[PDB]
Amino acid sequence: LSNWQTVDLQWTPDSTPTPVSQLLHPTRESQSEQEMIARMWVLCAIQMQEKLKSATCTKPHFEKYRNWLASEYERFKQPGYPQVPDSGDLVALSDGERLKAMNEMRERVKDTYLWPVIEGPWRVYDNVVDIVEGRVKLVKVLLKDGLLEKFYDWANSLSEVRPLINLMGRTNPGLRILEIGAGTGGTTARVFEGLNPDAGKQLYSSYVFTDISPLFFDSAKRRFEAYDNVEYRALDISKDPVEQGFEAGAYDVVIASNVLHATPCLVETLKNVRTLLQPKGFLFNQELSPPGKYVDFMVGLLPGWWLGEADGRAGGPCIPPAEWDRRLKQAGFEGLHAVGLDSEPPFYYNANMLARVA
């Protein structure tokens, strides 16, 4: 990552490169909670094996998940499973003792920020048959009691991105910002804090909150009721934004957290982001590329997790920064500009990437 260690916005003659470590960095050491998470989803995954095998996988991708999960379960019975070196002892527990351990982990994290990342995998285990047999949707399962929003709050909690946002806003106090696939608003919430440093100071002219799904807009209008000059408009970034009613080149910063990898073709997606940006504009792209399989476990029951092979992403939709750099160059960006991980490698979750229009 040594070529992407500084940020130089070049929006005013004032511009001096700033070390990325002051602008995008981890908020804390996170190995304990990451190993708590890994431990939990490994326990659920073990507990799912017999349930999955007797279940009727009603769609091809449910079969892919069952097959994938069976192969990962074989990895638990080998030494040195990443972040779970005692995975073998978890396989060695009785079914009843494993249920006891899973419920102890839920009880431990109740009323903490870690609640969604422990409860989430439990719910996947607890509903898997109803899900693969087409009686309940995964997303509905994860929506209950606000878990999805709190889950994305957890992921965002690992990255400190407010100094970068603050620098952009102090540099351009009329910042025109658009966020792709803002969803529950986990990243929107951090970004506004960087744009609102003090009462009576708003370092942006306009925040366009977008998602492909307008179903998010009511709750996000509640969540961000305190902020002025926010719009809420649908947008599919896999398709031309101008034809969808957006103005080409009318934005200084485009924000995207863990949405771009959900699109079928990253280069076309990045070209659509570039269409929105002014000639000196920036994409700030927060994107998973952890080495472990917690995200595979959590969202593998969705058909979209199995796209990627026609887009050079056979192993799954998430790619590390070197791959983003490649595809940014193919889309008219200067490759990556700066990158900061939400943890010291190799056990990080999100790469926080800034890319400039070429």
Ligand X SMILES: Nc1ncnc2c1ncn2[C@@H]1O[C@H](CSCC[C@H](N)C(=O)O)[C@@H](O)[C@H]1O
262 belongs to the binding site for ligand X (CB under 6 A): yes
Nearest CA-CA partner of 132 in 211, 243, 32, 57? 57
What's the min distance (Å) between Cβ of 272 and ligand X?
Answer: 9
What's the min distance (Å) between Cβ of 176 and ligand X?
Answer: 18
Interacting stretch for ligand X, rule CB under 6 A, among 30-38, 119-127, 207-215, 320-328?
A: 207-215
Site string for ligand X, 169-188 (x = CB under 6 A): -----------xxxxxxxx-
3-state secondary structure the chain: CCCCEEECCCCCCCCCCEEHHHCCEECCCCHHHHHHHHHHHHHHHHHHHHHHHHCCCCCHHHHHHHHHHHHHHHHHCCCCCCCCCCHHHHHHCCHHHHHHHHHHHHHHHCCCCCHHHHHHHHHHHHHHHHHHCCCCCHHHHHHHHHHHHHHHHHHHCCEECHHHHHHHHHHCCCEEEEEECCCCCHHHHHHHHHHCCCCCCCCEEEEEEEECCHHHHHHHHHHCCCCCCEEEEECCCCCCCCCCCCCCCCEEEEEEECCHHHCCCHHHHHHHHHHHEEEEEEEEEEEECCCCCHHHHHHCCCHHHHCCHHHCCCCCCCCCHHHHHHHHHHCCEEEEEEEEECCCCCCCCEEEEEEEEC
236 is in an annotated binding site: yes
Question: 126: how many CB neighbours lie within 10 A of its CB?
Answer: 17
Q: Which of 83, 159, 263, 285 binds ligand X (CB under 6 A)?
A: 263
What's the min distance (Å) between Cβ of 210 and ligand X?
Answer: 7
CB-wise, 6 or 219, nearer to ligand X? 219
305 belongs to the binding site for ligand X (CB under 6 A): no
42 belongs to the binding site for ligand X (CB under 6 A): no
Q: Which of 57, 102, 117, 237 binds ligand X (CB under 6 A)?
A: 237
CB-wise, 67 or 213, nearer to ligand X? 213
What's the min distance (Å) between Cβ of 63 and ligand X?
Answer: 24
27 is in an annotated binding site: no
186 is in an annotated binding site: yes
CB-wise, 119 or 211, nearer to ligand X? 211
Interacting stretch for ligand X, rule CB under 6 A, among 37-45, 93-101, 136-144, 255-263?
A: 255-263
141 belongs to the binding site for ligand X (CB under 6 A): no
Nearest CA-CA partner of 44 in 69, 62, 61? 69
CB-wise, 133 or 236, nearer to ligand X? 236
259 belongs to the binding site for ligand X (CB under 6 A): yes
Size of the site for ligand X (CB under 6 A): 21
What's the min distance (Å) between Cβ of 13 and ligand X?
Answer: 34
Site residues for ligand X per CB under 6 A = 152, 180-187, 211-213, 235-238, 257-259, 262-263
Mark the binding-site residues for S-adenosyl-L-homocysteine, compressed into ranges.
184, 186, 211, 236-237
Mark the binding-site residues, compressed into ranges.
184, 186, 211, 236-237
